[PDB]
Amino acid sequence: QPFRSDGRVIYCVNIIYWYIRLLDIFGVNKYLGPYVMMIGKMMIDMMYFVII
Amino acid sequence: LGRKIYEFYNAPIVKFWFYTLAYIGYLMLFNYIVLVKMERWPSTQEWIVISYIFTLGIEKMREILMSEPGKLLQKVKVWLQEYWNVTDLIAILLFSVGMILRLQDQPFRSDGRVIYCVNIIYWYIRLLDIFGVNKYLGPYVMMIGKMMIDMMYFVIIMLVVLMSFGVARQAILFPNEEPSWKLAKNIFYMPYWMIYGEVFADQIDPPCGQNELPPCKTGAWIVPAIMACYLLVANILLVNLLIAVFNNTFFEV
Amino acid sequence: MLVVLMSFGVARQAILFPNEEPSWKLAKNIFYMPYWMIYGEVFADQIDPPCGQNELPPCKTGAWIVPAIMACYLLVANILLVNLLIAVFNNTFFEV
Numbered sequence: 344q345p346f347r348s349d350g351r352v353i354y355c356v357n358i359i360y361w362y363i364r365l366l367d368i369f370g371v372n373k374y375l376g377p378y379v380m381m382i383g384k385m386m387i388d389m390m391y392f393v394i395i
Numbered sequence: 396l397g398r399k400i401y402e403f404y405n406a407p408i409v410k411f412w413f414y415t416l417a418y419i420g421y422l423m424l425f426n427y428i429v430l431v432k433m434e435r436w437p438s439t440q441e442w443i444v445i446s447y448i449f450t451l452g453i454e455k456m457r458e459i460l461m462s463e464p465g466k467l468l469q470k471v472k473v474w475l476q477e478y479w480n481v482t483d484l485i486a487i488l489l490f491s492v493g494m495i496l497r498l499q500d501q502p503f504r505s506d507g508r509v510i511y512c513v514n515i516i517y518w519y520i521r522l523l524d525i526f527g528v529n530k531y532l533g534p535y536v537m538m539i540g541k542m543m544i545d546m547m548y549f550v551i552i553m554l555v556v557l558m559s560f561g562v563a564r565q566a567i568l569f570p571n572e573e574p575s576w577k578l579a580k581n582i583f584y585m586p587y588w589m590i591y592g593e594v595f596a597d598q599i600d601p602p603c604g605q606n607e608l609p610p611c612k613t614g615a616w617i618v619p620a621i622m623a624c625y626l627l628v629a630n631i632l633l634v635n636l637l638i639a640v641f642n643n644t645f646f647e648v
Numbered sequence: 649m650l651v652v653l654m655s656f657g658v659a660r661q662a663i664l665f666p667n668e669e670p671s672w673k674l675a676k677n678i679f680y681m682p683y684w685m686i687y688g689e690v691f692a693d694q695i696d697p698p699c700g701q702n703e704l705p706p707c708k709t710g711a712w713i714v715p716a717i718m719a720c721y722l723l724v725a726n727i728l729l730v731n732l733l734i735a736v737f738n739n740t741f742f743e744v
């Protein structure tokens with residue numbers, strides 16, 4: 344410390360991305376994969392929502 | 396008139412609305428059982444409820460033993476084909492073990508009461524089968540059934556996002572906890588009630604390091620930012636996709 | 649919604665209050681808390697109230713079911729049937 348708990352915070356932010364990487368495993372399923380790329384399509388529309 | 400009684404009674408719409416009114420009667424009696432207290436021995440109203448479940452089980456056993464296929468395995472196979480029959484069997488067995496724990500004195504008695512009120516849920520849901528006779532409600536029932544899979548997909552991706560907000564909240568704010576299962580409660584507690592309204596507004600960024608406070612935990616500013624991210628993704632993206640899924644599946648189903 | 653709402657009403661008013669007499673206030677409490685939960689108020693204080701501790705009135709046994717099933721109810725009411733009402737309102741709109 345004082346660096347130790349900040350490294351813990353860095354681990355804590357990294358578990359966010361290591362959950363989001365489950366979408367790659369979700370991309371093998373014939374029912375889930377198109378839904379994942381579909382979310383990737385809807386992100387732009389939500390971006391326009393975010394500016395307005 | 397002596398054949399007219401038989402003509403009315405054995406007619407199938409009549410024999411259906413008998414069963415509907417008997418189901419409504421049983422369900423009102425079971426509500427009076429489970430809400431009101433229960434003594435050491437069962438009451439009269441509860442004896443009616445016990446008798447309904449037992450004679451229903453007799454009818455289910457009978458209708459197993461009046462199906463055409465020759466083998467007993469074949470009869471239980473063709474009976475296990477229809478899903479409401481096997482859920483009927485499961486609920487009847489759970490109510491019977493609840494009855495056995497009820498007739499037994501405490502502490503088993505109130506556990507039996509718990510089993511009773513968990514069967515209350517399913518014996519409410521069987522009124523959907525009762526609603527299936529209507530030409531306007533039957534298709535709605537099958538519609539609920541067909542969009543449950545579209546909700547299932549939503550449920551897995553919601554678990555993935557909800558656990559993200561959960562772990563990052565439980566591991567920024569609370570930093571020093573021994574191995575305990577209580578963390579698993581917190582993991583699925585606070586993020587899940589945020590979808591349906593309640594943002595838990597008092598407990599996002601408590602005031603801290605002030606004189607009036609407990610010491611500020613390092614990095615506690617990232618929790619409102621990730622709650623912003625989760626709240627936008629959960630209530631603006633995926634629920635709205637579920638709107639879209641449901642509409643474009645409605646025209647087909 | 650009436651069927652699903654009252655199954656929740658029965659379940660919560662059964663587990664939480666275990667020694668209630670015949671009274672019509674039970675028929676109020678069966679509808680009261682489920683109904684204002686559709687509209688954006690989940691009654692956050694009484695979701696999993698702390699019980700059986702020293703810091704309180706004890707836990708009714710089986711109370712841990714009451715949050716869990718309520719989770720299920722919020723997935724049925726606010727996510728399934730209101731969304732089907734969106735769909736129902738939307739693809740009969742052209743006709744009407």
Ligand SMILES: CC(C)CCC[C@@H](C)[C@H]1CC[C@H]2[C@@H]3CC=C4C[C@@H](OC(=O)CCC(=O)O)CC[C@]4(C)[C@H]3CC[C@]12C
Nearest residue numbers: 359363379380382383384386556559560621624625628
């Ligand atoms: C829990 C809190 C912190 C919210 C976290 C939000 C983001 C970190 C995640 C949530 C959903 C993710 C998106 C889900 C789906 C996709 C598609 C995927 O891209 C592809 O599959 C490539 C093809 C395509 O672009 O569609 C990865 C990017 C993207 C937009 C993801 C980008 C990162 C996002 C916005």
Ligand SMILES: CC(C)CCC[C@@H](C)[C@H]1CC[C@H]2[C@@H]3CC=C4C[C@@H](OC(=O)CCC(=O)O)CC[C@]4(C)[C@H]3CC[C@]12C
Nearest residue numbers: 416417418419420421422423424438439440441443447
């Ligand atoms: C089967 C469905 C369609 C309901 C049909 C209603 C009636 C045929 C039954 C259902 C509940 C019954 C009641 C359940 C409990 C009681 C209390 C009972 O009083 C006692 O048991 C206390 C005195 C004693 O033990 O003798 C008198 C009959 C009564 C009113 C019963 C009268 C007949 C009722 C209304």
Ligand SMILES: CC(C)CCC[C@@H](C)[C@H]1CC[C@H]2[C@@H]3CC=C4C[C@@H](OC(=O)CCC(=O)O)CC[C@]4(C)[C@H]3CC[C@]12C
Nearest residue numbers: 415416417419420421423424425427431438439440670
């Ligand atoms: C026509 C079909 C749709 C069935 C309609 C159901 C009614 C005829 C039943 C359902 C619940 C019954 C009630 C359930 C409980 C009681 C309490 C009972 O009083 C007692 O048991 C006294 C003892 C005590 O309460 O401790 C008197 C009958 C009554 C009002 C019952 C009257 C008949 C009711 C309203």
Ligand SMILES: CC(C)CCC[C@@H](C)[C@H]1CC[C@H]2[C@@H]3CC=C4C[C@@H](OC(=O)CCC(=O)O)CC[C@]4(C)[C@H]3CC[C@]12C
Nearest residue numbers: 476477478479516520536537539540541543720721724
């Ligand atoms: C408070 C919580 C616990 C409520 C949860 C409700 C669900 C568990 C229920 C409500 C609607 C039900 C559905 C309504 C209609 C049907 C159709 C029915 O299937 C058939 O008739 C097909 C039979 C065959 O083809 O062999 C039974 C399953 C299903 C999907 C049901 C499955 C169970 C569901 C999703």
Ligand SMILES: CC(C)CCC[C@@H](C)[C@H]1CC[C@H]2[C@@H]3CC=C4C[C@@H](OC(=O)CCC(=O)O)CC[C@]4(C)[C@H]3CC[C@]12C
Nearest residue numbers: 365554555558562573574575576577578579580582583
């Ligand atoms: C993709 C999803 C399913 C991941 C979910 C992750 C966590 C919610 C789980 C995974 C492993 C779990 C841990 C596995 C083992 C234990 C030990 C357990 O210890 C005891 O019960 C003490 C008993 C004793 O050893 O005397 C306390 C819960 C804990 C930390 C669990 C807490 C919750 C954890 C972290």
Ligand SMILES: CC(C)CCC[C@@H](C)[C@H]1CC[C@H]2[C@@H]3CC=C4C[C@@H](OC(=O)CCC(=O)O)CC[C@]4(C)[C@H]3CC[C@]12C
Nearest residue numbers: 550551554575576577578579580581582583696712716
């Ligand atoms: C696919 C859908 C239906 C959800 C996926 C299932 C799991 C994510 C859920 C289902 C039941 C849940 C469990 C139900 C009960 C408990 C006990 C609970 O223990 C306590 O809360 C005791 C400590 C305390 O006093 O808080 C910890 C979470 C846990 C393991 C839950 C962890 C998450 C589980 C396994």
Ligand SMILES: CC(C)CCC[C@@H](C)[C@H]1CC[C@H]2[C@@H]3CC=C4C[C@@H](OC(=O)CCC(=O)O)CC[C@]4(C)[C@H]3CC[C@]12C
Nearest residue numbers: 393600602603604611615616617618619620621623627
């Ligand atoms: C339409 C959307 C995309 C625009 C608005 C979203 C963000 C720009 C906002 C929403 C909530 C805001 C957060 C709300 C509260 C805080 C806590 C705050 O922490 C502190 O001040 C430290 C503690 C203290 O007060 O002593 C730092 C800014 C931050 C993360 C804010 C940063 C900006 C955020 C993420």
Ligand SMILES: CC(C)CCC[C@@H](C)[C@H]1CC[C@H]2[C@@H]3CC=C4C[C@@H](OC(=O)CCC(=O)O)CC[C@]4(C)[C@H]3CC[C@]12C
Nearest residue numbers: 649650651653654673675676677679680681682683684
């Ligand atoms: C299934 C969906 C579509 C509708 C479900 C909603 C109603 C059946 C419920 C919701 C709230 C309930 C009300 C909540 C509270 C009261 C007050 C109550 O009056 C008292 O308790 C007297 C005042 C006092 O307690 O001093 C009379 C019943 C009433 C109107 C209830 C009647 C039934 C209501 C309207």
Ligand SMILES: CC(C)CCC[C@@H](C)[C@H]1CC[C@H]2[C@@H]3CC=C4C[C@@H](OC(=O)CCC(=O)O)CC[C@]4(C)[C@H]3CC[C@]12C
Nearest residue numbers: 419422423426427431654669670671672673674675678
């Ligand atoms: C299954 C769905 C469609 C309907 C559910 C109906 C129940 C919630 C109702 C029907 C019968 C009702 C009972 C009928 C009679 C009474 C007696 C009543 O007692 C008095 O009013 C006391 C009078 C006095 O002081 O003498 C208290 C409510 C109670 C238990 C009622 C509670 C609510 C019940 C169980």
Ligand SMILES: CC(C)CCC[C@@H](C)[C@H]1CC[C@H]2[C@@H]3CC=C4C[C@@H](OC(=O)CCC(=O)O)CC[C@]4(C)[C@H]3CC[C@]12C
Nearest residue numbers: 649650651653654671672673674675676677678679680
């Ligand atoms: C949703 C559509 C299809 C019609 C719904 C009708 C019933 C579900 C509602 C309509 C009026 C309601 C009743 C209005 C008034 C009362 C009195 C109320 O009594 C009290 O609150 C007593 C005072 C107290 O709480 O101390 C209990 C609920 C009850 C029976 C309500 C029960 C539910 C009822 C019958």
Ligand SMILES: CC(C)CCC[C@@H](C)[C@H]1CC[C@H]2[C@@H]3CC=C4C[C@@H](OC(=O)CCC(=O)O)CC[C@]4(C)[C@H]3CC[C@]12C
Nearest residue numbers: 550553554580583584587696699707712713715716719
């Ligand atoms: C898959 C997506 C749709 C998320 C689903 C959320 C569930 C997995 C979560 C939400 C609320 C959770 C419940 C919230 C509170 C409790 C009480 C808890 O009971 C105790 O801790 C007992 C001690 C006490 O409370 O006195 C056991 C876990 C449980 C049922 C949790 C189990 C897991 C639940 C149902």
